Amino acid sequence: IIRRGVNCLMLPKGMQRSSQNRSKWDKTMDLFVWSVEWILCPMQEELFKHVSHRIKETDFLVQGMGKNVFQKCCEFYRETKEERTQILQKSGLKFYTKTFPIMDSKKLVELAIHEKCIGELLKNTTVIEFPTIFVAMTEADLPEGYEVLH
Amino acid sequence: EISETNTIFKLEGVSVLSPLRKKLDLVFYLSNVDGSPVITLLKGNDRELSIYQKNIKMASFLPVPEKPNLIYLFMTYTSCEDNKFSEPVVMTLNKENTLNQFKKLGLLDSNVTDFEKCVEYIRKQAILTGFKISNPFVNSFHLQCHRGTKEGTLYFLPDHIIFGFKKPILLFDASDIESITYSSITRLTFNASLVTKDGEKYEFSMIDQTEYAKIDDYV
């Protein structure tokens, strides 16, 4: 099913992921909101995953992170949304979602988080239920099996 | 083979003590070969043990003597992959961790603090994997005792008795219990002996006397 441009693959409901999707159209706010799966890749020589809910389609990507998730970036690397949002922008963290031609993928595309809102970053893509979004200082750190396309 | 698209349930970080000692991940998923459900334990993407479906005979959440941040999931089975093991699956979930993990999966909100919410969820995914996990300490009871020289926990459930968890782990279906005969050693402590319909005797010694009442009542 296709919400707000985004092409969304829907798993059978029994599936854990299906129950971890809360992406919906939100009446009062008058827009679409988005669960994303954050996967933080720290600096190797162990992952931290977190799923945020009700992120506003009209928000830059850093804007809809989440305290805990920031905190956790702040420990893998180096406090109101205002600042948090501001400290990740001058940060050097690259952000990769994954890319598709039902089937999982290990092909990633880096995305230009500061030059677009989530809704635009997602418009003509595919997600499995809802975006997964990898975070790392370098590619080396992304999980093994995962390969980025430039 | 297994990923987010055929994974029924996935909990990282369980402390498997039988049929092996190791920190593992617990996973229910439907095989992409034939749509069939499977229980596996993973090390990253190793599979130390997989059970396919029938196969699981009995499974249950059990408390950990004297340790409430902790909980056993106990599962018995007719067979597994390569017959690598035979002994029952005992593992130990941490409560607090379980909650925070359910939270980091977005399965439960920041505020929720009742573990039985996790438990509800595990029991349900399990039914989706062709099997029941009972939860009889939410009328059951357990006590300490010894077999020969080894201490263990004797748990008394509605339809089973389990003696755990040093190898060999015993399970007795209640309907297989011909008799339990009692025997004093002190005013403070006694021995109980189970007798199976096929004549095997199992001498559960050194039970505290305060437990006597609960055992008679059970029969």
Author numbering:
A (entry chain B): 128 to 172, 178 to 210, 225 to 247, 253 to 301
B (entry chain A): 66 to 118, 121 to 205, 218 to 298
Recite the paper's sentences.
Biogenesis of eukaryotic box C/D small nucleolar ribonucleoproteins initiates co-transcriptionally and requires the action of the assembly machinery including the Hsp90/R2TP complex, the Rsa1p:Hit1p heterodimer and the Bcd1 protein. We show that Bcd1p binds Rtt106p and controls its transcription-dependent recruitment by reducing its association with RNA polymerase II, modulating H3K56ac levels at gene body. We reveal the 3D structures of the free and Rtt106p-bound forms of Bcd1p using nuclear magnetic resonance and X-ray crystallography. Bcd1p interacts with a region that is distinct from the interaction interface between the histone chaperone and histone H3.
To understand the mode of interaction of Bcd1p120-303 with Rtt106p65-301, we characterized the 3D structure of the complex using X-ray crystallography. The final structure was refined against the dataset collected from a native crystal to an Rfactor of 21.0% and an Rfree of 29.7%, including all reflections between 20 and 2.79 Å resolution. The asymmetric unit contains one Bcd1p120-303:Rtt106p65-301 heterodimer. The three loops in bound Bcd1p encompassing residues 173–177, 211–224, and 248–252, respectively, were not built due to the lack of density explained by their high flexibility in their native free state. Indeed, the two 3D structures closely resembled one another and 3D superimposition revealed that no significant conformational modifications of Bcd1p120–303 occurred upon binding to Rtt106p65–301. We concluded that the conformational changes induced by complex formation mostly occurred in Rtt106p. The crystal structure of the Bcd1p120–303:Rtt106p65-301 complex revealed that Rtt106p interacts with Bcd1p only via its PH1 domain. Most of the residues from Rtt106p that are buried upon interaction with Bcd1p are located in two distinct parts, including residues of the first S1 and S2 β-strands, solvent-exposed residues from the contiguous α-helices H1 and H2, and residues from the loop connecting these two α-helices. For Bcd1p, the interaction interface mainly involved the solvent-exposed faces of helix α1 and of strand β6 located on one edge of the central β-strand. A hydrophobic cluster formed at the heterodimer interface with side-chain interactions of four hydrophobic residues from each protein.
